[PDB]
């Protein structure tokens, strides 16, 4: 009725919650924790690719572009999802990685990892502050998938532009569901798109921590599964070096 068709479709294709398959019964060490988060990441990566095959318009981009967009955005999509689950299930007061892997301050012993968690915590915090709706979150997540492209652009750049515009228009409709004011809705659009822009710097810290841990994996006793190892090796160094074009809503 009032909920736009595309938004209902996005709600319908959102994956079912993913479990980390984490022990719990045993004392979590820093390395065991990271290993468990990587196992969760491997399971979420599969989920992300399956989700993308049902995402309107995505399957129509050139296959190389589809692969490139997933390899550029997996970290962003996953931390954004973490933000949403944390917001929804624990009022943003704990990091809800999975139902069997919820982290609070007490479990973040490692000072470097705790610092990374505080960075991640910024998202649920903004979600709480802005009171982001399920409808807004769904459209913003798609925009994140489409938020970075190669320096030379995509093979299906035209199709990509149209897709991105369609989802920007859908985010506007989501905002309109609760933002009556023409300026209030406008200021809302500004706030939400500014949040997406800010994710770029946030994700960069996650990318750096990941690539470092990946290179020191044997030394840190941290295991990375095969699919995650592939995306890291295929693009992280390039992304970190800034050899990609981040798309920004605000100059
Ligand atoms: C092991 C490691 O370096 C950590 C640092 C940042 C961590 C990621 C942070 C974001 C994230 C959220 C999830 O819900 C799944 C796991 C992932 C994808 C995490 C997997 C483990 C990572 C990559």
Contact 64, 107 (CB under 8 A): no
| Ligand 1 binding pocket mutation candidate from 33, 39, 41 (most atoms within 8 A of CB) | 41
Q: How far is CA 61 from the centre of its chain?
A: 20
Between strands 244-246 and 95-98, the pairing is unpaired
User: Which DSSP string corresponds to 181-208?
Assistant: SHHHHHHHHHHHHHHHHHHHHHHHHHHH
CA of 107 to the centre of ligand 1 (A): 15
Residue whose token pair is 């917001």: 87
Whole-angstrom Cα distance, residue 75 to residue 69? Answer: 11
Tell me the β-bridge partners of 95: 103
Tokens of residue 239, six digits: 């992304």
**Closest-CA residue to 5 (of 189, 169, 186):** 169
In sequence order, the 6+-apart residues with CB closer than 8 A to the CB of 139 are 7, 10, 167, 170, 171, 174
- What distance in Å separates the CA atoms of residue 123 and residue 47, rounded to the nearest whole number? 21
Q: How far, in Å, CA of 107 to CA of 114, rounded? A: 9
Q: How close is the Cα of 38 to the center of ligand 1, in Å?
A: 6
Report which of 235, 239, 242, 132 is spatially closest to residue 192, judged by C-alpha positions: 132
Q: Where are the domains of the chain?
A: 1-251
CATH number for the region 1-251 comes to: 1.10.565.10
In ligand 1, which atom is closest to the CA atom of 98? Answer: 14
Cβ-Cβ contacts under 8 Å for 222 (sequence gap 6 or more): 31, 34, 35, 38, 213, 216
Could you give the CA distance from residue 18 to residue 26 in angstroms, rounded to a whole number?
Answer: 21
Give dist(CA 55, CA 146) in Å, integer: 12
CB count within 10 Å of CB 156 equals 17
User: Whose C-alpha lies nearest to ligand 1, atom 6?
Assistant: 206
Q: Are the C-beta atoms of residues 50 and 75 closer than 8 Å to each other?
A: no
29 sits in the region (left: phi over 0; alpha: psi -120 to 50; else beta) called: beta
Query: Please, are residues 194 and 249 in contact by the beta-carbon 8 Å criterion?
Result: yes
Tokens standing for residue 125: 């915090």
Contacts of 8 (CB under 8 A, 6+ apart): none
Distance CA 37, CA 29 (A): 12
Q: Which two tokens stand for residue 85?
A: 């689950």
Q: Which two tokens stand for residue 57?
A: 């318009």
121 lines ligand 1 (CB under 6 A): no
User: How far apart, in Å, do the first and last CA atoms of the chain sit?
Assistant: 36
The encoded tokens of residue 56 equal 């309107």
CB 171 within 8 A of CB 141: no
Determine the Cα–Cα distance for residues 199 and 93; give it in Å rounded to an integer: 20
Contact of 174 with 138, CB cutoff 8 Å: yes
Tokens of 21: 């398959």
Cβ contact 76:147 at 8 Å: yes
Give yes or no for a contact between 162 and 213, defined as CB atoms under 8 angstroms apart. Answer: no
Contact 116, 82 (CB under 8 A): no
226-240 and 30-54 helices, crossing angle to 10°: 90
Estimate the share of the chain in helix, then strand, then coil, as percent rounded to the nearest 5: 70, 5, 25
Residue 153 CA to residue 245 CA, distance in Å, equals 8
Query: Which of 70, 196, 181 has the alpha carbon at shortest distance from 132?
Result: 196
Report resolution in angstroms: 1.8
> How far is ligand 1, taken at its centre, from the CA of residue 168, in Å?
27
Measured from the Cα of 213, ligand 1's closest atom is: 3
What's the 136 CA to ligand 1 centre distance in angstroms?
Answer: 24
Distance (angstroms) between ligand 1 centre and the Cα of 62 equals 28
Cβ proximity of 116 and 206 under 8 Å? yes
Helix axes 30-54, 111-130, angle to 10 degrees: 40
Atom of ligand 1 nearest to the CA of 44: 15
3-state secondary structure of 101: strand
């Amino acid at each position: 009725q009032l909920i736009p068709p595309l938004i209902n479709l996005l709600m319908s294709i959102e994956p079912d919650v993913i479990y980390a398959g984490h022990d719990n019964t045993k004392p979590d060490t820093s390395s065991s924790l990271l290993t468990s988060l990587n196992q969760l990441g491997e399971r979420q990566l599969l989920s992300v690719v399956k989700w993308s095959k049902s995402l309107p318009g995505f399957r129509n981009l050139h296959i190389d572009d589809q692969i490139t967009l997933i390899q550029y955005s997996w970290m962003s999509l996953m931390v954004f999802g973490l933000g949403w689950r944390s917001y929804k299930h624990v009022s943003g007061q704990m990091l809800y990685f999975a139902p069997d892997l919820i982290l609070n301050e007490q479990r973040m012993k490692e000072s470097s990892f705790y610092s990374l968690c505080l960075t991640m915590w910024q998202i649920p915090q903004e979600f709480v502050k802005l009171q982001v709706s399920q409808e807004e979150f769904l459209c913003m997540k798609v925009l994140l998938l489409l938020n970075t492209i190669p320096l030379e652009g995509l093979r299906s750049q035209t199709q990509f532009e149209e897709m991105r515009s369609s989802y920007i228009r859908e985010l506007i409709k989501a905002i309109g569901l609760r933002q009556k004011g023409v300026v209030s809705s406008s200021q809302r659009f500004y706030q939400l798109t500014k949040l997406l822009d800010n994710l770029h710097d946030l994700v960069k810290q996650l990318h750096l921590y990941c690539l470092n841990t990946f290179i020191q994996s044997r030394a840190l006793s941290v295991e990375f599964p095969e699919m995650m190892s592939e995306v890291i090796a295929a693009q992280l160094p390039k992304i970190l070096a800034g050899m990609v074009k981040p798309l920004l809503f605000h100059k």
